[PDB]
Write a protein that binds this ligand. Sequence first.
Ligand SMILES: Nc1ncnc2c1ncn2[C@@H]1O[C@H](COP(=O)(O)OP(=O)(O)OP(=O)(O)O)[C@@H](O)[C@H]1O
Ligand SMILES: Nc1ncnc2c1ncn2[C@@H]1O[C@H](COP(=O)(O)OP(=O)(O)OP(=O)(O)O)[C@@H](O)[C@H]1O
Ligand SMILES: O=P(O)(O)OC[C@H]1O[C@](O)(COP(=O)(O)O)[C@@H](O)[C@@H]1O
Ligand SMILES: O=P(O)(O)OC[C@H]1O[C@](O)(COP(=O)(O)O)[C@@H](O)[C@@H]1O
Ligand SMILES: O=P(O)(O)OC[C@H]1O[C@](O)(COP(=O)(O)O)[C@@H](O)[C@@H]1O
Ligand SMILES: O=C([O-])C(=O)[O-]
Ligand SMILES: O=C([O-])C(=O)[O-]
Ligand SMILES: O=C([O-])C(=O)[O-]
Ligand SMILES: [Cl-]
Ligand SMILES: [Mg+2]
Ligand SMILES: [Mg+2]
Ligand SMILES: [Mg+2]
Ligand SMILES: [Mg+2]
Ligand SMILES: [Mg+2]
Ligand SMILES: [Mg+2]
Ligand SMILES: [Mg+2]
Ligand SMILES: [Mg+2]
Ligand SMILES: [Mg+2]
Lengths: 528, 528, 527
Amino acid sequence: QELGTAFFQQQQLPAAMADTFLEHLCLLDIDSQPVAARSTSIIATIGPASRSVDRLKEMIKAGMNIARLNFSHGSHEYHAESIANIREATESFATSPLSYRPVAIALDTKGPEIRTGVLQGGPESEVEIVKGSQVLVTVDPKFQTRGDAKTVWVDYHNITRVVAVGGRIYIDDGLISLVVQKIGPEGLVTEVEHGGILGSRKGVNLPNTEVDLPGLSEQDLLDLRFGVQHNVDIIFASFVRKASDVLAVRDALGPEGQNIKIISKIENHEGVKKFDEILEVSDGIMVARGDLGIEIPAEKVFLAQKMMIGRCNLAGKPVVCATQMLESMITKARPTRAETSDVANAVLDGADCIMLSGETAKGSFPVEAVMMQHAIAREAEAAVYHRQLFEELRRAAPLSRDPTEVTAIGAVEASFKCCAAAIIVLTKTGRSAQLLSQYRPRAAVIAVTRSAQAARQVHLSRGVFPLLYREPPEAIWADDVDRRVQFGIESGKLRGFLRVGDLVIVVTGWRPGSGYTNIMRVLSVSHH
Amino acid sequence: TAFFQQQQLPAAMADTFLEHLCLLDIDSQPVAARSTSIIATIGPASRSVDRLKEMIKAGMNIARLNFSHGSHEYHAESIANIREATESFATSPLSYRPVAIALDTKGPEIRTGVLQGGPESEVEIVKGSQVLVTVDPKFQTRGDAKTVWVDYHNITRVVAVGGRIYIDDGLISLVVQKIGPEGLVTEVEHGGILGSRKGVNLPNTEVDLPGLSEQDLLDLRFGVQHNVDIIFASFVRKASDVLAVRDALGPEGQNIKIISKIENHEGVKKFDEILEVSDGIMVARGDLGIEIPAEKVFLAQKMMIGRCNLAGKPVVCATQMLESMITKARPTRAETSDVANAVLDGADCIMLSGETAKGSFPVEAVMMQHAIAREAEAAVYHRQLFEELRRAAPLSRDPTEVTAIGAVEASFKCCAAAIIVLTKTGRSAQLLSQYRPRAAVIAVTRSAQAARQVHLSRGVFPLLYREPPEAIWADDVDRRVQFGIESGKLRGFLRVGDLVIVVTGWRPGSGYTNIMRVLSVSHHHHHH
Amino acid sequence: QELGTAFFQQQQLPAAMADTFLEHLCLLDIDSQPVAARSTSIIATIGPASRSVDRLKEMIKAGMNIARLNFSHGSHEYHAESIANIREATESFATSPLSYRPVAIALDTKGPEIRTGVLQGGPESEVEIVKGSQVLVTVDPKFQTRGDAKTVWVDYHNITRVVAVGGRIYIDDGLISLVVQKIGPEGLVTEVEHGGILGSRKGVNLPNTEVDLPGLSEQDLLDLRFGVQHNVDIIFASFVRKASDVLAVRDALGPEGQNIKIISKIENHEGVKKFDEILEVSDGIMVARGDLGIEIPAEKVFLAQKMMIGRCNLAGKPVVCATQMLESMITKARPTRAETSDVANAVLDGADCIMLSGETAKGSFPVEAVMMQHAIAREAEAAVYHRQLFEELRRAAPLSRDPTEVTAIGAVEASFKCCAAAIIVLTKTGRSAQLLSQYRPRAAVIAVTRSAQAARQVHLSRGVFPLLYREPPEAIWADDVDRRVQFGIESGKLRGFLRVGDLVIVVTGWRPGSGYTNIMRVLSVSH
Ligand SMILES: Nc1ncnc2c1ncn2[C@@H]1O[C@H](COP(=O)(O)OP(=O)(O)OP(=O)(O)O)[C@@H](O)[C@H]1O
Ligand SMILES: Nc1ncnc2c1ncn2[C@@H]1O[C@H](COP(=O)(O)OP(=O)(O)OP(=O)(O)O)[C@@H](O)[C@H]1O
Ligand SMILES: O=P(O)(O)OC[C@H]1O[C@](O)(COP(=O)(O)O)[C@@H](O)[C@@H]1O
Ligand SMILES: O=P(O)(O)OC[C@H]1O[C@](O)(COP(=O)(O)O)[C@@H](O)[C@@H]1O
Ligand SMILES: O=P(O)(O)OC[C@H]1O[C@](O)(COP(=O)(O)O)[C@@H](O)[C@@H]1O
Ligand SMILES: O=C([O-])C(=O)[O-]
Ligand SMILES: O=C([O-])C(=O)[O-]
Ligand SMILES: O=C([O-])C(=O)[O-]
Ligand SMILES: [Cl-]
Ligand SMILES: [Mg+2]
Ligand SMILES: [Mg+2]
Ligand SMILES: [Mg+2]
Ligand SMILES: [Mg+2]
Ligand SMILES: [Mg+2]
Ligand SMILES: [Mg+2]
Ligand SMILES: [Mg+2]
Ligand SMILES: [Mg+2]
Ligand SMILES: [Mg+2]
């Protein structure tokens, strides 16, 4: 009502109050400055360009929420040191819960993939595959660490039997195309159709093939155990084809790994086909557009993205958009017009998380890349048409008898009614926060938890801002609850989420332990 | 399985109103408690203590006393019998049904005199005949088929030649030929059988009458003195009329609900300003259907009900709803349809006049309104209604308003059997009712008057709590909540395994409602 | 803009342009006068009160479109007299051959029903059945025309067996309730639970019983042959319980009766159960609330009504709302508040036709009952929320490869874009008009036909105004088409449907014969 005239001209609120989508579009305003904290989480792949403690400190300040460790590269020893560095940088800000941001760690698996070998000049070297040249693809292990511009080793022994003369071999998410001329004892003699810069251990994709490949290799098992031992938060499971891939991963993690979240990467035609069964048994999904867009026609990937994000939004499960989002920023300080558009559109499509790969793992501007995802996402989030979104989730979602579910829809609705600055929720596992996130409030969901791991893992859900509460239980449980709510309000103040006289929605439960969230309260923020 | 086939839920799921209509099913039994209150006019057929007990059991919520007829003593008698009948059930507080008492004013009505042959005589007014309309005192008790006396003395200076004079629910029509010293010489345009003291209507004649007459002031005084809950104020033409009623009621009468009756053209014209200053509205279809064309009344009804639904204020549909049941045991097909459509239009209350005041079947008239309303309430298209009311309601920083919408949203998500709310004045209950939930709003109150008055708001079931305050206020709050659930179970509104939403406040006194909770109803008598 | 902003204040146009239903209600305005011609057709039942040529003429002036003959009453001879008087009244206006109104004739069957006998005194007489008294229900032929306050005859010979002791016999749409005390040789001796005034030949309804009645009795077959031989337009087929019932009717009408519309009456529980298979093989539906309201619980009838009209509107097939709509006007000059509201809500529910029974058949105010239905229907039509109704039909209905379908939706959309005063359609059978009527245009459908029967029959679909074209062909077909269209336009001007400067939509076909409608044009009304 009377927060000010100015209030209703900010954060695209004229567009928010449109009666149609079309009218909503027409009312978008470049001069309407975003106000809410950026809610879509940024995942940054950690490699040579992003490994130092100093650099990780600036990536955290720029907006990094989740660090991705790609086990298709490096080694256990390398990734262990990456983790050490991440945790040093993260904990450097723990001095005062004023700038303390949890950072989650994700292990991205190799999975049923085909990779090239390490070049002659070593794992950080490159060679130029030239258009028109002859290239031998070999399976002879003597070439495993001795690849160059003429001979490429591959780790799938059976390629020779499986690829046809005149057939294509693609390298590095389709960067390089080889056409098979001849088959024989030496391997596959190819001509380079499209050339480029080949690095070490690059992905190999084979059109017109149905390679049966284990699913969990012996290396995969070592990698998941490494994950459990180093207490990673998330598994990004590569090339999930079917439900049983997800269950195999859940099995190998074991009961000690039971709390680790599994985000299934959809990277091929089969995964898209079996999406429903995959999503059912997964904690969430990654639209892995690098592999996907060379496994399926490039012009079709956007249908897959929009569909999978839609379905995850409906299921209330985290979804990640990935790969080539700000690609040009590997060598330039500013992105292309298509790249800003792609990020904005991933937020508008409804992604919980967006991701940087080469842009942060090996590029010249890792910090700028994080900064740019931050700035775009914050603008896109203000432009979501919540009215239609919320209305469509009501119409489409099932009825629920779960009291936390019921509480969360009422809490979010209440947050719109009064333009609440935040919804403060107590959560042991993240779940009560996740169930608020699914209705996409404009209000920040501030999740207060004692669980360090839950604080990291809630970054998967758009708009959940974790606060690690560190005080030991009060003598009286009601007083412990109150102190945690007050903690959320005061961190809200000091982080600029709240000010005296804002309204907040508070979501609690009626007893200790998980699953008893059933209370929604409306509070005015005051001084003491 | 069976659950989803009742309460017209197949029709409730429909994607369009059209498909909703197509899916309505006569075999789908309502299960909700009846939410549209029944106002029964009390008179000869309905004032014995025994009859009134049967009428309470049939569903009567509000007793109307029509002060167009009967002495003060006759009305005081009716009140004592109503209170006796009501209080006969008070030895069962979990089942006790409050009954409100409404005083309907005489207002500026015009009536004919007594006939020569006295108050049981009747005379034929023949069409084509000349009849004088006189205000000569000597004709007050000497009416015949050629002279009719009228109690509006100023009628002879206010009805110009060519003016129409309607008598007895508009069934007799006179057209003025001349204004003489003897009065209005007229011609019978429509004829009929005329009795004593019959209502007169003067449409397209602006009357001089005061608004509050000396009798009205006596009658409003009587109202305060006998602690009536509601004034139905006859012939409200403008906002100043409403304020005159509020002033006469005095400081003693401040809490009495004023429901303005819209009975003529000017009242429709000035509806908006009238509704502003009133607690609610009655579509008084009897007078209105003579004052304006009969074939336009349905537009005024639907307009007024809509605007009231928009304002979150109670609206009453009245007059001739089950008219035939004055003499017959079963109503006409038009009459059942009238009742159902009043509910579907959005009426909070429906009314019975002659059918309960003087007819042969008062109890069965009440039973019939009960049964129809139940069927119609199940058939309301909530999906559309809820959205349109959500969207039309303004943003609010008032926590009662914020919590109300969260609780109704929540009710809909779990198909909650009830919303239980504590209220001192009825307001927190009204703010739920205004979103038209399918769930029953069980209002728990210590105030006997509020318990009576909340019957004006659709879907509010008052429970009068009688226990002395617990020493700890939170305990007192909890006892009332558990009392609401236990009354709910006993009256069969709630069964074990149902979810209820509970609505409470953070301190004592009106205006601090701010908490919504989700409970399960257990077999046990304490719930969580 | 340049219609004059007075145009956007009449006809409930502010309410028409609401964004929501709720806003639409809030904008309804009693000072906003209707301007369109009344589109919901009025069916009047013809009996004692409506027999004379002068009376029928007045009923036609008041707005009667269909005359209903109830063969549960009278005799062949009686209805032949009625028909002759209806046609003489109808043809008395053929003088000015564009103020001629076709009037359809509907034969309403007995069907599988039970009825009481003729009283002592004859079919004009009445007796009071007194509450508490003892009444004998008998199957003895000697009481067949000898009924009184104490013995009532019924034409279901096997009634002694189907009704238990302590079971209810309802008479005249539930007006009278009898409870069976004892079962014996004379019949059933009953005590009167609810009394009332009994006439001759009143409906008997038996709750919690099954009766074995054929579907088409020997009398039904005689009555349908009568209908064919007297060139009736419509059969209102009583107590349609299943799809086979409709097909039997269609069989009995035979090749001679091919073009007669069957409107199936839904009046009991089985009929509601089997609605979908009945509507499928029927030309239309009647919601027969008299019987229906004593066969099922009275508080349920409104659900059945709204469901059935909703489904008919979706199937694009005409539906009639019937019985007790203006009941009090049997004795009173003015209706009750419930009655006006009922008529309005029938129209707002989407009924194509509204009906009068006793109000015109036997009451004191037949003409004023018709006038009242006319007045209400006209107000209610302007209050339809076209915006939502069109949208939901578009969403709900199937796609179609039929050129007439495709053209109709186009035409109606075009009618809205320009506020066309009329859509003019050429039709042989009415089908092309009907397919426009299903989208409920605010614009009048002026249907130009050479078929007198079609011109009577199209009254069944809301918004269709028939113009019977009388001229003989032109050498060139295309010239004949253009003259029929010109007839439409000049007829609309004269009747005040149209003025110079109105737009009209014109719907035509590419060749003669039925089934080839496929053209829509936008014309300015000339000179
Ligand atoms: N830990 C690392 N050490 C060295 N180089 C790395 C590391 N992580 C990533 N890279 C480099 O950055 C590139 C892009 O990273 P990204 O994580 O997308 O891997 P990818 O090879 O495309 O496989 P995926 O399909 O799993 O994304 C890699 O191809 C590799 O050249
Ligand atoms: N042709 C007629 N001759 C004499 N009286 C008639 C005739 N038609 C109708 N009536 C009178 O009007 C009443 C109502 O007319 P209506 O056509 O509704 O008949 P009904 O008995 O109600 O049977 P249905 O269930 O077919 O309507 C009849 O019961 C009868 O008293
Ligand atoms: O989101 P989750 O994991 O269900 O946890 C929410 C739980 O948190 C609480 O607010 C607090 O529980 P604790 O005191 O055990 O932290 C409970 O009332 C509620 O059931
Ligand atoms: O509906 P109202 O009149 O505002 O009353 C609601 C009030 O009832 C309560 O729930 C209980 O108050 P009391 O103990 O004064 O009855 C308050 O917490 C709340 O403000
Ligand atoms: O509505 P129906 O019976 O299908 O009639 C539509 C027919 O009327 C016409 O406009 C004219 O046909 P006729 O010339 O045979 O009268 C045809 O073009 C069209 O197929
Ligand atoms: O694996 C990925 O991240 C991809 O392929 O996009
Ligand atoms: O006073 C009334 O209730 C009326 O006139 O309808
Ligand atoms: O038969 C009828 O017309 C009825 O019963 O309503
Ligand atoms: Cl009786
Ligand atoms: Mg990988
Ligand atoms: Mg790859
Ligand atoms: Mg990649
Ligand atoms: Mg990949
Ligand atoms: Mg009064
Ligand atoms: Mg009145
Ligand atoms: Mg019949
Ligand atoms: Mg009838
Ligand atoms: Mg019938």
